[PDB]
Ligand binder design. Structure first.
Ligand SMILES: *Cc1c(COP(=O)(O)O)cnc(C)c1O
Ligand SMILES: *Cc1c(COP(=O)(O)O)cnc(C)c1O
Lengths: 302, 302
């Protein structure tokens, strides 16, 4: 098989030190163990495979794929494009870190650096311009239903099976909305009482009725409500602060041997809050989007 | 389960672009998908578990473990020590990169920086001094048979099973010798004709009768013959140059979607040479010790 075949089937671990006796069990699915280093491997593969199934793409064609991202989705798309023979162009603000650019270029992605002042807007604009000029395929991660489908068909079933259908609450820090929608729907169809709780940065708390803002939870909290997020599934929203999440992420690494990413610290912090509310005997499940490997040069581990 | 339970059961992928039609199949087992980021998770866990079984250690005791390493074994040991409640002290030359120190400290390992001029010798000396002063447990990765056992009991069986017992040659870049000895023995006991080929840096070619020297294949080629390496198992030794291995590693990332480490480039390069020799129909298996994540600030991906 090829690298795309190695995506998924990730393990789930039960926290034992950062939890307290009055809390429900807390289980964390480790998506950083994917070949691309994050949970985004799943929607990256699904969006490309879906495009192949629909006839938009054919592998080994050299066809162009373009997406305005420099994050985990960019890494996942680059990995798949490399394996299946597609030309990938990623647009992103020019103030992008050298480290991240090196990872993307390692996979052969072409990078187009856009106006640092216009931020994400300029990146989106260039991706649209390229899509039109080249007749390229744009995954469109925030609106593509195949993103949600990836989680409804793989992540959800895996989580449900591993925890033997015993889940009282599912907690996740939403980015594109694909994971919480896909997993959330899968669980709610089988567990009548399960609660689906979204997590977002207090500094960019739009789901809570607040306002967008800069924050340090890379990968989550886009500052807007994506089309792939089904709000009707949510039973609540927990706002998290880096001041609380980062120290917790460090505890996870030193006390549980779980070296996770920035968003994982926020997600697990929220999961613990839910665990205290539900109490002993109950089970809270959450997902770690990625490991700490890409963040050694950030406040989390610096 | 805990993080140590998530070690192993790694996938194997078949190369499709860097290979040529006149070559045997080339399969690569991805050990970078382990929770600690490398194949060393296996011997790290086995050496600690073996010590617990023998009564040297008891988990959650706070007992001290000391080892002269700053590499993947250090990361693996730190992860396990964090999860099972041991105090880990790692000794290493003071010229250690900040990046690596950050990973080790993230897991809670205590670092003792030794004389930069005495290199590894000073690190070994301090570990021995601490072992004596504190009555600590020193895994002793180059001589501990539990290292070999990890691969004889897990890595080998996994590789054999995944390739349905059809393996004509096993190729690996030796460090402590545990992997090639453990996997090699497992395969030779079942495949009468299988060849076990060791790989080492041409710049530190001691297995080839040459001399030790500085090289860039982090994790392999220790410059000496470790006690854990069973020379009687070897059917040959291939010397590799960074000049050849690094460009190949970049091709693997851009053409196969396999973002691997420095030693993987050397190991796969050698595997391709063996594949050309065996020809079509045959099957060559090798292992990628780790991914490219820890090497973005090295000549390989810089
Ligand atoms: C993508 C991502 C998320 C959010 O997952 P979605 O399915 O997009 O909601 C969270 N953290 C990180 C690090 C991510 O890359
Ligand atoms: C440990 C290691 C090796 C060698 O494996 P051994 O079982 O110790 O021979 C090769 N490459 C890397 C990156 C390693 O960490």
């Amino acid at each position: 098989m090829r690298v795309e075949g190695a995506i998924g089937k990730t393990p789930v671990v039960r926290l034992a030190k950062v939890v307290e006796p009055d809390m429900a069990e807390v289980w964390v699915k480790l998506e950083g163990l994917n070949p691309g280093g994050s949970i985004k491997d799943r929607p990256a593969w699904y969006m490309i495979k879906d495009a192949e199934e629909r006839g938009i793409l054919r592998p080994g064609s050299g066809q162009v794929i373009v997406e305005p991202t420099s994050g985990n989705t960019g890494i996942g798309l680059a990995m798949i494009a490399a394996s299946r023979g597609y030309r990938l162009i990623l647009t992103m603000p020019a103030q992008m870190s050298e480290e991240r650019k090196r990872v993307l270029k390692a996979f052969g992605a072409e990078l187009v650096l856009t106006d640092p002042e216009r931020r994400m807007l300029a990146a989106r604009e260039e991706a649209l311009r390229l899509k039109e000029e080249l007749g390229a395929f744009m995954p469109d991660q925030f609106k593509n239903p195949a993103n949600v489908r990836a989680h409804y068909e793989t992540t959800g079933p895996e989580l449900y099976e591993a925890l033997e259908g015993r889940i009282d609450a599912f907690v996740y820090g939403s980015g594109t909305g694909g994971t919480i929608t896909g997993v959330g729907r899968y669980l709610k169809e089988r567990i009548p009482h399960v609660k689906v709780i979204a997590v977002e940065p207090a500094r960019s708390n739009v789901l809570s009725g607040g306002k967008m803002g800069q924050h340090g939870f890379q990968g989550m909290g886009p500052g807007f409500i994506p089309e792939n997020l089904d709000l009707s599934l949510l039973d609540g929203v927990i706002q998290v602060w880096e001041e609380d999440a980062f120290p917790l992420a460090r505890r996870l690494a030193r006390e549980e041997g779980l070296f996770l990413g920035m968003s994982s610290g926020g997600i697990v912090w929220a999961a613990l809050q839910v665990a205290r509310e539900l109490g002993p005997g109950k089970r809270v499940a959450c997902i770690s989007p990625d490991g700490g490997w890409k963040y050694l040069s950030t406040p989390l581990y610096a």
